[PDB]
Each structure stands twice: as C-alpha cells, then as structure tokens.
Design a protein around this ligand. Structure first.
Ligand SMILES: c1ccc(OCCNCc2ccco2)nc1
Lengths: 237, 300
C-alpha cells in the first residue's frame, strides 16, 4: 500500500527497496518563436532511483535525443522512466533486485506496474510523503554530469558520501531530505550555507562538504532556519 | 410457441420470464407459462416473497427439450427439469391449457426488445460459461462468482466468463508496454477476437449474457465482465466498423431496458464516462451516448 509517516522506519529495514523520482526526466525551456508563438526546447534530464538504506543512487541520464520525433512527451516520459527502471532491475543479480519500488508521483504507478508484470513479487507502491527529490539537480556534481552528457548514460553515486560510517541510514536519509528541501525552497541561500566557509571542501569522490559531526549539527540547524523562514517570507508569518 | 409448465406453486414468489414478471401467491393455482417465442434463448427467474435474498433462475431454449418447473421443499427452490417422455409432456400441457392455468408470454407484436438483448446469445455458449453438462438448461443466481473473482470458492458453481485483465502478460506484449496499454487493439483483435472468441458474434454473445445476468440477478461479477468487455472495445483505436455499429445498438437496448432505480449499482461511472467522452470510440456510439445523456445524465 501507500508509504507515509506511520510506516517510515520501513525504509531502513533489510528488504531492498528503491525510490523512483521522475520529476527531472522531461525538462524544457519555454521560449518565444520568431513569429511570436511559444515553443519548448528540451534539455537533458535524469531518472533519480535511490536505495534509501545504502545511499546508492542509480542516475540514468535522459538525453534530449530520446524525444526526437515523439508526441505527447510528458506521457512518454513516464513510460520511458518505467522502461529504464525495468532494464536496471533486470541487469541486477537476483539477490540485489528490490522487493519494493516506491514512486514519488502516483502517475508512475501504472507505467511501472505494466513494465514489471513479469516481476509479480516486486511491489509497486506510492507514497504520501512529499519528498524533495526534484532538487537533485541543485546538487552541482549531479547537474554537471546530466548537462554534459552527449548520449544516454547511467552514472552511479552514493548520495550519502561516507556518512553511513558515522550515522544510521535513518539519520542519513533525514539529513538528505533536509538538505534537498532547503535547496528546493531557496537554492541560493541553501548553497551559501553549504559553502560559506572556504576551509570545508567537497572531496573529489563526494557530493557534499566534509563536515565534522559538530559542523553537521550547525549546518542542519541553518537549513531548518532557512526552511522555517522562507515559509514565513512565503506566508507572511 | 412453446410452454414451460409448473407442477404447482407452493411458495409465494415473483416469477420473471425474460423482461417480464408477475406475482404468484402461496398455493395459487398456477401451472406455468405458454406462448414462449421460439428462436431465442429465454430465462425464467425467481424471487421468493419471504426471502428476497438470492434471485435465481434458468437459461433455456425450448428447441432443446421439454422443460418444466417443480418446487423442491428440501432445497427450497423452484427447480427446472427436463421431461424425456414427449407424450406425457404434451398431455400435461394440453390439460393445463384447457383449464387456462398458464400465463401467456406477453410479447407485443411491434416489440423487438428481447431479440435485441439476445441477438448473439446462444445456449451452447451459455453452457460453457455455466458448466453443468447433465442438463440442457443453466442455473444462475445472485451469489455466483466468476473464475476471475476466484483468482482474487467452489469451482463447480462458477461463471466461467473469459478473463480480461488490462495489466497482464496476455494483454501486454514484451516491448509494446506503452503501446498496448494505451491502445488495446492488439488485445481486442488478436488475443481475444482472433484467438479466444474466434469472431465478434461470440464476443457480443458473452457481453450480452453478462449484462442480462447482472440485470436479472444482481450478479456483481457479471456486471464487472460486461463493463470490461465494453471498455476493451472502447479503449481500442482499431476496431472493425461493423463491430462499433453493432456495439452501439447492443448497448442502446441494454441501457433502454435497465430499470431506472438500479442504475446506481448496475452502471460504473468511470467506465461509461471514459467510454463516452475520453476513449478512442468516444465519437462512435451515437445511439448509446444519446440515451445515456437523456436517461442518466447524473452518472455523467
Ligand atoms: C526492456 C528490456 C527488456 C524487456 O523485457 C520485457 C519485459 N517487460 C514486462 C512485460 C510485460 C509483458 C511481458 O513482460 N522490456 C523492456
């Protein structure tokens, strides 16, 4: 059934599961044409497929060539997503395949379920959580590899860096969702928070800065402030 | 014009014969139904006055044998039986007709309703949906479940309708996922019509039988089957033109005949709005769309 706050620790048990977010698959810029009409120009996108327990991110880059000559692109994008999750699961060894796939948008249910009819023991589930995975393209290294791609490509990341050496997957996921919620509510401020101090760097093999435990508490507090504020500035409170 | 005699009417019952119905009182001198039109299947059905629970009845074709009804006080229902002695039967019916103890099948000459509801329904196909091979007639009641209902519990008492499931490996070919799910023409024309039903007449016959079991017995699995067989056609971009035209006629007479006070339970809002206003065939069911809009505008 649907995934919500009542069953949130299920994300961190030992049944393999993946979140799939399709919000960055089909991306466009809207512009005026010479005749004064409006047109879209597609830009590269990505499927965000994440194991919340391990931090493993399977980032399938969606090159704009996949839309050439196609109609109804917003609908095709959901089916393309489903077909991409389907090949990924099929390439994994049986003991690595997920027991559940959780889609962040309900319109992905039928495409993914039709694509995995020959995988009946994998549960396809919605969620009631409003997860901020759309903000993945505000992570500089992820955005860079998507925009530079000249062909379809899968890139593998650990979105938790090395955090699991010191914290649990519950805490890592909570940190991730806080960082992404911040980046989604006010990207400039969030990014200022994360890099204000030049002495803290991002390792070449990491996505986020190398904060100590104490610095993460500071950072996490600053992100909460950002989010509560913006929510004032937004709602005037 | 054939006859279905009754041994007696020991319990008070509302009796249906096709789209007609009449009340019989407890121990009233009632000995059956005469002037039944030859050439069509028929259904004779029952609702006891003391227990409206379980409508039940029998599909039959008078060309296939001499059938009568007899109440069974042990099992508590009116049972259809076949009389194999032709001379005994003729003699029984002649006596009951002479004493005017039979209701006349009350068909108006202008009226093609029953033909229109049963055009493609054949007894031989009914007997493959309702398996009881020792009888020439078929029992159906309100509670009977379908084979597909049982996959989601006595198999001998099931309705073996053709299983339709839009999210299944039969309905979807590997590599044609989005195509086959959004346009069901493959599933309609190749899997079902060419492969399973053989022709559209048999498909329409099962569709019509499903509707009639839904209407006459409140059989929920039959209603599900009727709507699925409609949705499968409406959700196909490629349908033979003669099939669309005939479907419109079939559904028109089903909607015309449906009791107005049963529309809430016998019509699925989602299926009908999708079929009439969103589907590939949204512009192909003129007669059906017009009667639906004038009779059940609330559903839509
Ligand atoms: C990309 C790679 C392989 C592949 O295999 C076909 C499995 N698709 C599921 C399904 C529906 C009906 C039957 O099987 N599909 C897409």
């Amino acid at each position: 059934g649907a995934m919500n706050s009542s069953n949130y620790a299920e994300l961190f048990n030992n049944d393999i599961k993946l979140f799939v977010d399709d919000t960055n698959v089909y991306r466009v810029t809207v512009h005026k044409t010479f005749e004064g009409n409006v047109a879209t120009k597609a830009i590269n996108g990505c499927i965000f497929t994440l194991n919340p327990k391990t931090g493993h991110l399977f980032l399938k880059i969606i090159h704009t060539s996949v839309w050439a000559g196609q109609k109804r692109l917003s609908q095709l994008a959901k089916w393309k997503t489903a077909e991409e999750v389907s090949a990924l699961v099929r390439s994994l060894p049986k003991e690595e395949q997920p027991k559940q796939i959780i889609v962040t948008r309900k319109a992905m249910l039928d495409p993914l379920e039709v694509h995995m009819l020959d995988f009946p023991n994998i549960a396809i589930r919605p969620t009631e959580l409003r997860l901020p995975f759309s903000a993945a393209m505000s992570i500089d290294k992820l955005s860079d590899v998507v925009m530079k791609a000249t062909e379809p490509q899968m890139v593998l990341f650990n979105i938790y860096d090395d955090w699991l050496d010191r914290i649990s997957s519950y805490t890592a996921f909570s940190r991730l969702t806080l960082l992404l919620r911040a980046l989604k509510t006010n990207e400039e401020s969030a990014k200022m928070i994360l890099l204000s101090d030049p002495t803290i760097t991002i390792k070449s093999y990491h996505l986020w800065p190398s904060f100590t435990d104490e610095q993460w508490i500071t950072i996490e507090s600053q992100m909460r402030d950002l989010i509560l504020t913006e929510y004032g500035r937004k709602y005037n409170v | 014009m054939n006859t279905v005699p009754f041994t007696s009417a020991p319990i008070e019952v509302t009796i249906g014969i096709d789209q007609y119905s009449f009340n019989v009182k407890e121990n009233q001198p009632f000995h059956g139904i005469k002037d039944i039109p030859i050439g069509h299947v028929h259904v004779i059905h029952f609702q006891h006055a003391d227990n409206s629970s379980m409508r039940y009845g029998y599909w039959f074709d008078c060309r296939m044998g001499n059938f009568y009804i007899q109440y069974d006080p042990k099992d508590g229902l009116y049972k259809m039986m076949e009389e194999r002695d032709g001379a005994k039967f003729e003699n029984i019916v002649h006596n009951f007709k002479e004493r005017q103890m039979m209701v006349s099948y009350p068909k108006i000459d202008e009226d093609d309703t029953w033909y229109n509801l049963t055009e493609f329904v054949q007894m031989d196909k009914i007997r493959k949906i309702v398996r009881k091979d020792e009888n020439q007639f078929s029992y159906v009641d309100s509670s009977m479940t379908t084979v597909q209902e049982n996959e989601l519990s006595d198999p001998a008492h099931s309705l073996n309708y053709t299983v339709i499931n839009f999210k299944s490996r039969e309905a979807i070919r590997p590599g044609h996922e989005m195509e086959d799910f959004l346009d069901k023409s493959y599933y309609l024309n190749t899997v079902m019509l060419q492969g399973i039903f053989k022709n559209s007449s048999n498909y329409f016959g099962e569709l019509q039988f499903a509707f009639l079991n839904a209407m006459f017995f409140g059989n929920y699995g039959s209603s599900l089957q009727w709507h699925a067989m409609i949705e499968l056609i409406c959700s196909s971009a490629t349908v033979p033109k003669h099939m669309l035209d005939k479907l419109d006629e079939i559904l028109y007479y089903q909607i015309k005949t449906l009791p107005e006070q049963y529309s809430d339970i016998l019509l699925n809002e989602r299926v009908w709005n999708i079929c009439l206003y969103s589907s590939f065939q949204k512009n192909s069911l003129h007669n059906t769309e017009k009667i639906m809009e004038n009779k059940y505008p609330e559903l839509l």
